[model samples]
Target chain A: CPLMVKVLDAVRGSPAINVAVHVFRKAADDTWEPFASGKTSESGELHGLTTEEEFVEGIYKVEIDTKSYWKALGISPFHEHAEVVFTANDSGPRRYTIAALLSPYSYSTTAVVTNP
Target chain B: KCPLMVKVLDAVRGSPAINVAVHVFRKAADDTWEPFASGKTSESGELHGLTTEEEFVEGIYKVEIDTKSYWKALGISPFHEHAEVVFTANDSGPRRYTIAALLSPYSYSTTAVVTNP
Candidate 1:
């Protein structure tokens, strides 16, 4: 399935382009291992194309590292990194569309799932 | 019963989210969100200590902001389910909180703050 994620600034007014994006999987040892990686484009969009095993079962996460993204611009971000967690082949829907609206102090994630 | 409160405002501007429609719902036994409390932000961007105790049950509940209604109720952009937030309830204290939402059209965040009243 295609996981489309967007990272945006206040009111979606300006795109947070070139922000670092990382994907991780939760292991049985409860350790989170990097599954894949990507970044936001000029339009602040990251498309996560699922691999076979990566999408089968387990807890997957999308982490948006916004520390440097804002800090370099001189804003001390409250949350250094933002995380969105989900499980595969579970009660959740078959497809996922995750979007996060973020600021220095707060952030929010919206997940739109469509079942088969 | 606990008196759950909410204070709505602009996330970045610190302005009132006046007339914004906010809805509270509990996760039903059938795995659906059932409406619990619904109201709009007043002039000062607050509910001003309104009591939401009678229908506020002990369970997982989600709060949704009606962005579209707030727009029609302003004629703005695409809005619906501004921010979706859920909390676990054990029928306890500190259950009293100001459900503060810093809202936007693209996305929004929900944070439970200590009493503003």
Candidate 2:
């Protein structure tokens, strides 16, 4: 199965904001391990990745780098960081689609996966 | 339905920040009046006021100013204002209210509203 993720960056009054996305998989000991990481484009979109082949997934976590993006503009934000964690099954034999949006003040994410 | 009323204050960093408060009044004649007002204490103190729903009639309204106390606490020059909001009800329509504020080390803004008219 293939995994696809999309990220949107909405920086209200300023130009494009930089963002880093981290993919982590749960280990047998119940800790998460880094699988892959990618940077978002000027329009705040990042895609194309595989999670099934990388690790046997039970739980996964995604993190966004928000502090550095705000600091680049010489502005301080109320929230320094944000992240989302989700669960996945190895038995699934279909593709997954995940989307997320980020801004200086707020962010949201969603995941869509097909079943076998 | 009951009317809505709210208050806020201003602040500055190092300089003397003015703590100000405004009272909003709403009337039934489609006219709103803001008359009561107050200021912060000696560059650094609590900013307070009084607002009641009975004072409001029915209409859209807002109150706002800069946050001078916040700036003054940081030892920076005061240069911001704050605001409060008050609105009234006329008909049996559902009343929804929102109080939003923007704040920085130097300035701030706030508003009160009913979610739906």
TM-score of each: 0.53, 0.47
Over A5-71, each residue of candidate 2 has an lDDT whose tens digit, in order, gives: 5665443422233577787877888888887778777656556646446545468777767767667
Candidate 2, position A41, lDDT: 72
Instruction: Give the clash count for each candidate.
Output: 2, 31
lDDT of 1: 0.71
Local distance difference test values of all predictions, in order? 0.71, 0.52
The candidate maximizing TM-score is 1
Candidate 1 C-alpha lDDT tens digits along A1-116: 55677878864468888888888889889999888888888888887556444576678998889777877667676777988888866764477777877766667789987775
**What would you estimate as the lDDT of candidate 2?**
0.52
Once fitted onto the true fold, the runs of candidate 2 whose alpha carbons sit more than 4 angstroms away are: A1-12, A50-57, A75-80, A88-116, B1-47, B53-100, B103-117
lDDT of 1 by residue, B1-117 (tens): 336767776653446788877788889889998777777789988764444566556789787777666645445464454667788766545456567876655556567864423
RMSD per candidate (Å) reads 9.7, 8.4
